[PDB]
Amino acid sequence: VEDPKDFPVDLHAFLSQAVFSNRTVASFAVYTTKEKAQILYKKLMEKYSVTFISRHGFGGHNILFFLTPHRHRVSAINNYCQKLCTFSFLICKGVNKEYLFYSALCRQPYAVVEESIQGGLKEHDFN
């Protein structure tokens, strides 16, 4: 109805728009509701054994950002997430700039809510 159809525009810079790609990657984002995100935060951590995952607020919606040990098609992460949704929207894309995306999601108009690693994510954990 008035559900979003993509991520907020300030994050497009960070996201891959080719959702049907055969290329397998290791960082992902999910834009959905507080409720759905609260659950996926725990499910994803267990299904993908994420090396890291965080949940961020934006009005009433949430954005999950997570890294995985092994690579996966964006298509696959999405399919898994969508099975938890019926009427709630949910957008899932691949993330290119890991530490920068995570940065933007830690500042206005966004904010961190919960993380799987204290202090969160440090810049030196990347190239």
| Domains, the chain, ordered by start | 1-127 (3.40.1310.20)
How far apart CA 68 and CA 19 sit, in angstroms, is 17
The SS3 assignment for 17 reads coil
Q: What's the maximum distance between 2 C-alpha atoms anywhere in the chain?
A: 42
Number of Cβ within a 10 Å radius of residue 61: 20
Resolution limit, Å: 2.6
Task: Tell me, rounded to whole angstroms, the distance of Cα 62 from its chain centroid.
Answer: 9
Which sign, positive or negative, has the C-alpha torsion 81, 11, 71, 64? negative
Rounded (5°) CA angle 28-34-36: 65
